[model samples]
Target chain A: MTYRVKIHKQVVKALQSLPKAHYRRFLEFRDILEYEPVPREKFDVIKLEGTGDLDLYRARLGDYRVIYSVNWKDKVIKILKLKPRGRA
Target chain B: GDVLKELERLKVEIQRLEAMLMPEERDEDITEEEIAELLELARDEDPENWIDAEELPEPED
Candidate 1:
């Protein structure tokens, strides 16, 4: 088969306003993840455990959490949300 | 002013991701993890990235 669109981001201010440090860390780690996301087990120990199996992974942008899902077939990552540490 | 400017930027970014920009660079393939990572990094550097989480799902086991 081919790439199939699977996700889209919900408009939120966190994306552009995310802290730079976390954002940079995310960028640096991104390549390695695109190749192979860090073990989901590291963060999937509690509930949301099933999240690891999905094609996407979440990462820190400073204090915000970046949630996204990947489409391996299309080699695409669909961002769904960006949340800062305190803002729920 | 900050809100309006931010809103415009956000709109551009969303369009870029949706390939609405009609530019080759805007249509690049990226991983979900990668997108999250980059955003994280940018947020880390954000001057106003401070936001406390009042509610969040439990952490992973």
Candidate 2:
């Protein structure tokens, strides 16, 4: 089952300023996630420590990290932030 | 604010490194975040950063 993924306006805006090549990769990653979006043993994603029931997770692309929340019940992935790894 | 400043600083440094390369010598090891910032900076500061390839193919649905 393909999960629904949504990118925040800031992320969409951020992509506008990125390299053409890098923007293309983020699009590829977006498609890749629709099919098998999360809880992969190989991909390193972590649960944010103090989100209560929000269940936010983080994943990395090179040094860029995306902070997001997954709603498995709704089968959605919401991208909150996309910035340099430690910078976020 | 300081973190974004550091990010801006690193983006500048990455652009400097990119300027010293040939078109065919594009670095594949560049992080996704860096490339994003790098290209943005190149647009404003230096227009000659080497990018040797056509647009990458989009993922098939």
Candidate 3:
């Protein structure tokens, strides 16, 4: 079974601002994560150094990215950030 | 053009396969030959080239 995902309010707000195509793709990614959370070879899940106990990961989805963390003990995925590949 | 039609067929097949493929494996399973073919098809199908310099609006004052 997949972990329970807890998305932040800021992330939900950000979703509304993404382009139509990318938004749909992001939702599809979310749905996939809900069922088979780990061993997601395609997303290239990696642990970032800064997040401490909460391991942060940046997954590439199309020309965009979704940054978040996972708590395996609790089986919960916490969505933290998302943005297009460029436009810094 | 037949080449353009062929390109469409390939792209649709790619899309279908992509749905079945793993989400994290973002790489497309296209080959070098397919890339060259797509480029040729694109060149043959579209006549519009880069806009002429004079066609562009004047630089901001």
Candidate 4:
């Protein structure tokens, strides 16, 4: 089943400030995430550690990184943050 | 009339103070050129470089 992707309010605000090209790229990445939130062979995805209890994952997008959690039971992908690498 | 004017002024002041008190939501300024360069660099680098290595296997009796 396809998963529905939800963007956090803070992430939405973050996207607003991105350059137009990067904004479009982010949307493209989001579309891919709808089908596969897991780490697939084709994507630069990895399971994140140190986030207690939450099934969090990170996906690299150019200079930015996306942090999201997948709810397999509900079939939802909740995007938590989108920030440039090295900032965290 | 004067009272209403002062009330509006006070309301504006309160809003400004509230904004200052709230956490700042700022994003780093990244240029399109930098993004393009990063994307190219990502393509050239090995994807495996990002993943952590698995722990060595332990002997089982």
Chain A: TM-score in each model: 0.50, 0.75, 0.77, 0.83
Which docking class does model 2 fall in? incorrect
Instruction: Give the poorly placed runs of model 2, Cα more than 4 Å off.
Output: A39-43, A49-54, B1-61
Worst 10 residues of 3 chain A by lDDT: A46-55
Candidate 3: tens digits of C-alpha lDDT, residues A1-88:
2445656555666766766776666666666665544324777654342222234455777676676655433545556566567354
Candidate 2 chain A has its poorest 10 consecutive residues by lDDT at A48-57
lDDT score, candidate 2, position B21: 32
Q: Note the DockQ of each predicted structure.
A: 0.02, 0.02, 0.01, 0.01
Model 4 segments beyond 4 Å from truth?
A: A39-42, A49-54, B1-61
TM-score of chain B of each: 0.31, 0.34, 0.33, 0.39
Query: Which residue pairs in model 2 clash with each other?
Result: none
Best by lDDT: 4
Chain A TM-score from candidate 3: 0.77
Q: Is candidate 2 or 4 superior in DockQ?
A: 2
List, residue by residue over B1-61, the lDDT tens digit for candidate 2: 8997566556444532432231211123334565444333322322242221123345333
Ranking by lDDT: 4, 3, 2, 1
Interface RMSD of each: 17.3, 18.8, 20.6, 17.7
lDDT of 3 at A11: 67
What docking class should model 1 receive? incorrect
